[PDB]
């Protein structure tokens, strides 16, 4: 609802397609003061475009590589100064290697599924780590998956390994966290179509099929992400943790 | 989520403790028109006071035992006359004899059995099929639901049952009324102090064990099921329909 | 396994189609004594010649409706004084009127709503409470289920919502009955073509997605059913009570 | 389920209290060959003296350090020259920093987090891909899981990541082998005392509150995995892939 006098740090804005600009317009639009985490230059460059389309009078920046806990401890500690305590987190962050999207799961190397692990599930833990010590009265965390880490999705192969490791990350982490009221949720999306979808074998096919087959007889939208992300950071949502929130037009509950 | 122009019809206020007071109030606030039903003469009495608390400007009372098709039916047919046209139904209701609540599952009766599934099951099915008469544009439609619905919990017995009938009552009226643009979803709350819960035995050890055992270390309480619900029947959640959302502390997510 | 001095009822068929056939023939093969439970006299003939088929050395057939609480009773204690203690109990009994099995759910009736919990549900409690007579040292009791209980299956309708049922039913009797060392369970069947899935809208459509999408790539039949069972009657699994075993080419796991 | 003729691969001995150890008395009493593997020399050590408790004609035993792809290649490799083609592999092989069992799952290390996917998720990948290339006609693997993977259990912190890991690892084999009739499963021990249970904290308080809670009132054993794993490994399971079969006296099912 009302966010006036929040803060939220929007982590994997890559362009205007990104799930997490969705979030971003929705918590502009209702009152937040938002910062942003990128990884590479190409995404800020486009944020900072993206931003002239946002009501933030100002540029919060900060450039952060989740495979190096030094930049996540560091850029969380600048964000603090810069801005003081935060009211949560969006995660909007996964990777893995495009030879891994595809043919047989069984043929995944040691490196790729280690890789999809550190930058898709345990870069949560250590942003929670960090982002606990700019939350002392509490706040809300909430990361991103999809369907594939529930059940096995033909082509979603290493990533949905990933995303069930996410998954589980923030049921311990919302046990863990939880005496120091901070809630941690994930929004299990639908599919969308992202600079990241275009990596994923089949992504066309499964568009189709959920028109056909979901209740809703559609497909989301990042907006409609970036709704259920700002219940999940905000009061509305204060007696719920350790939850995963379809937001898929109903395909998680057909079969 | 402002709600005004919208009216909600909430089925199942006793008092002021009932969970659909918790939503009542949080709508109220919001800005909704409500309509409320009620079983018993004492219900609609202690409706008649809880209404100097809220905004209404007016008083939308129908009697409504959903164990009796014409009056479900006549029921939303005198509240389209009156009302015309609403968003959604919040349905807060349940039954199973005291007997059923405590002792052993396995003794259950054939008669006390399917009383359950009638009020606590069917009858969100008939409230769906009539209410949708009224949501010509679309709107929301939320059950409220118990964890042993998804899991044995000493002592809930029959109504445990009946809840895993109400659950998927709620997954295929989604798959049904998606085409129409009608969204069905479930709040799973947590143990709250009401009318109902004086017969469920072993209500107190529970609340007891939640403070002790779930991430937040606290119970929850009828508004915060409101605020959800508030989320749950507005647009905010557009393209969440089929769902099962625990506000619960987390208790849920652990073992 | 290994059976010899076992005995077991197994409740549920029709003919020799029957998923309650394919476990008689396990069992049988697997040297147990069995006794057999029908409702209609087209059943009882069926028994009569598919008895041909088995080494059962002596037909024992009870008529049981478990509509009927008397017939139930009656028939449980007569198999008592018949051929003793048992060791557990096949469930494979379900009904719903077919005009219930396609188009809307939401238009579903009362009176078939109940009808189908009455049948495939409640019996199981029923059963389970008489059965629990003849197993002084514990046993085994098994129910059939269908992946429609666990998600929306597109006209299965009021049959999914007592499968919801059943499978809770599972559960709460496990907990109850567990210290008198009795394990109940549930095999999830995927579609096999039975006299019941005439009746099912949109069967054949089922059968093929399966080939195409399932794990195994194939559908399984009434014998792989069968094994299941004999594993779950047996003390192969005696540390295994409130399970869901899907016997269905992994399409469960799948989306 | 007589296993003669049949040859199983059993990775995870370390001695008498091995979960491993069960699943092999088991097989080994059905009439399996079994060929296993170990890391350290004091496990080869153990084996040696254990092998003289089996009907094992020979001792067939390589070491394998499943962080190591050329030792898993490789063993395999020199297993398929030894003994030629295998029906199965039972995998029971986890690892995680005593530090990551206890305490704030929030302060998990990136390297303690990654060594624990490693070692208890990854490694059933190159397992399944190497196993593979000895099961021509189809096979089935099984790996060894717990509930933690499916809730988050205090003290269980990183493995519990881990083990959703492996479980999501176990589906995404089921459906990418599955058209090469190799089934894969997952059993979910109830907690056991085994040299890896001394490094779990709160583990005596766990073991306890299972004996009063589950439906059985009992902890599991050893010998009772491996009779399911044996149900598993066999055809009497032939319908079964991607499922994850609680071996926990039933406390997966009850809240
Ligand atoms: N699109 C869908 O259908 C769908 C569905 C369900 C869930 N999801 C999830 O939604 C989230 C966002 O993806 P998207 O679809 O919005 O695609 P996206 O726009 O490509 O976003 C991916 C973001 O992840 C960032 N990232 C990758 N590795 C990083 C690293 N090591 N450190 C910091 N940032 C890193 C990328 O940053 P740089 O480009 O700056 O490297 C990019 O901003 C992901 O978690 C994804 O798994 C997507
Ligand atoms: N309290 C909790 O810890 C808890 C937790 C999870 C879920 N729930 C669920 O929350 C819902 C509301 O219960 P509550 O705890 O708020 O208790 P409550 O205040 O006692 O409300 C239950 C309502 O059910 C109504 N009802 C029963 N049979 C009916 C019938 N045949 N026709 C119409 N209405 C009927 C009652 O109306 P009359 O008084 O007029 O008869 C009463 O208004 C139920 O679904 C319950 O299972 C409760
Ligand atoms: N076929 C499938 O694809 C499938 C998949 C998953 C689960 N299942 C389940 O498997 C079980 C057996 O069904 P099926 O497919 O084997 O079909 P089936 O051969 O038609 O067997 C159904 C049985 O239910 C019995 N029954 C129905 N109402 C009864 C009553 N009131 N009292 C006593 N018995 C009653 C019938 O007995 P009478 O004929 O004597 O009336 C019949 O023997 C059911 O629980 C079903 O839902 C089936
Ligand atoms: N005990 C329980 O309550 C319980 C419950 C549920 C699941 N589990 C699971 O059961 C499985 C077996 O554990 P357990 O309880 O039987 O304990 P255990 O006897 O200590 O066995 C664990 C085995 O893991 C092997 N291992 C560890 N790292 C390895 C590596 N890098 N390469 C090859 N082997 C490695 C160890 O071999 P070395 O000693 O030779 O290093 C040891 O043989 C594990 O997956 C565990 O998570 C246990
Ligand atoms: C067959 C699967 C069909 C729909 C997949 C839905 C889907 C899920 C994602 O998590 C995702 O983000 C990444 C995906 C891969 C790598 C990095 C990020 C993009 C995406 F389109
Ligand atoms: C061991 C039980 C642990 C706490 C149970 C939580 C709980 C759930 C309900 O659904 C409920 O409403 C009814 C319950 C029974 C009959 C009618 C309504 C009240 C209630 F307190
Ligand atoms: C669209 C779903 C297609 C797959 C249906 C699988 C299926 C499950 C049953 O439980 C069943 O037994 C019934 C007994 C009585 C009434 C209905 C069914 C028969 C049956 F084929
Ligand atoms: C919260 C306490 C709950 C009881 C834990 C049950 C349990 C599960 C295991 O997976 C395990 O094996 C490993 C555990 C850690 C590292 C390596 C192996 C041993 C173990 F006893
Ligand atoms: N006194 C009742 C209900 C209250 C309670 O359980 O605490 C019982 O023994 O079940
Ligand atoms: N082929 C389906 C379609 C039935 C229907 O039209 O409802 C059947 O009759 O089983
Ligand atoms: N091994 C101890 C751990 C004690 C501690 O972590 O302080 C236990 O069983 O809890």
Redesign the interface.
């Given at each position: 609802?009302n966010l006036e006098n929040k803060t939220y740090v929007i982590m994997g804005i890559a362009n205007k397609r990104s799930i997490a600009f969705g979030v971003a317009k929705v918590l502009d639009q209702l009152g937040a003061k938002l910062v942003f985490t990128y990884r590479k230059e190409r995404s800020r460059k486009e944020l900072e475009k993206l931003l002239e389309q946002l009501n933030q009078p100002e540029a919060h920046l900060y450039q952060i590589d989740v495979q190096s806990?030094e930049e996540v401890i560091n850029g969380f500690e600048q964000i603090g100064k810069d801005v003081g305590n935060i009211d949560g987190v969006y995660h909007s962050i996964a990777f893995a290697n495009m030879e891994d999207l595809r043919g047989?799961?069984?043929?995944?190397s040691?490196e790729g599924?280690?890789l999809a692990?550190?930058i898709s599930?345990?870069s949560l833990?250590?942003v929670?780590?960090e982002a606990?010590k700019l939350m002392p009265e509490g706040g809300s965390i909430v990361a991103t998956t999809y369907?594939?880490?529930?059940?096995?999705?033909?082509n979603y192969?290493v990533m949905?390994?990933?995303?069930?490791?996410l998954?589980?990350?923030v049921?311990?982490?919302?046990?863990?966290?939880?005496?120091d009221?901070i809630?941690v949720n994930a929004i299990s999306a639908?599919p969308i179509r992202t600079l990241s979808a275009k990596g994923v074998g089949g992504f066309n096919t499964i568009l189709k099929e959920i028109e056909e087959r979901?209740?809703?007889?559609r497909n989301?939208d990042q907006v409609?992400?970036g709704?259920?992300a700002?219940?999940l950071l905000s009061?509305?949502?204060?007696?719920?943790?350790?939850?995963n929130?379809?937001?898929?037009?109903?395909?998680?509950?057909?079969?």
């Amino acid at each position: 609802v009302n966010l006036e006098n929040k803060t939220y740090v929007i982590m994997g804005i890559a362009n205007k397609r990104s799930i997490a600009f969705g979030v971003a317009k929705v918590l502009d639009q209702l009152g937040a003061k938002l910062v942003f985490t990128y990884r590479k230059e190409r995404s800020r460059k486009e944020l900072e475009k993206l931003l002239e389309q946002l009501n933030q009078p100002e540029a919060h920046l900060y450039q952060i590589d989740v495979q190096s806990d030094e930049e996540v401890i560091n850029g969380f500690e600048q964000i603090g100064k810069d801005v003081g305590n935060i009211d949560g987190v969006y995660h909007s962050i996964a990777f893995a290697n495009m030879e891994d999207l595809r043919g047989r799961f069984s043929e995944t190397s040691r490196e790729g599924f280690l890789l999809a692990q550190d930058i898709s599930s345990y870069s949560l833990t250590i942003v929670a780590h960090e982002a606990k010590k700019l939350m002392p009265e509490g706040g809300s965390i909430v990361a991103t998956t999809y369907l594939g880490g529930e059940f096995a999705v033909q082509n979603y192969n290493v990533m949905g390994v990933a995303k069930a490791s996410l998954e589980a990350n923030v049921k311990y982490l919302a046990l863990d966290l939880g005496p120091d009221n901070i809630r941690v949720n994930a929004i299990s999306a639908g599919p969308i179509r992202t600079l990241s979808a275009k990596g994923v074998g089949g992504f066309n096919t499964i568009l189709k099929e959920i028109e056909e087959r979901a209740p809703l007889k559609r497909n989301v939208d990042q907006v409609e992400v970036g709704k259920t992300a700002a219940y999940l950071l905000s009061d509305l949502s204060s007696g719920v943790t350790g939850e995963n929130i379809h937001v898929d037009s109903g395909f998680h509950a057909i079969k």
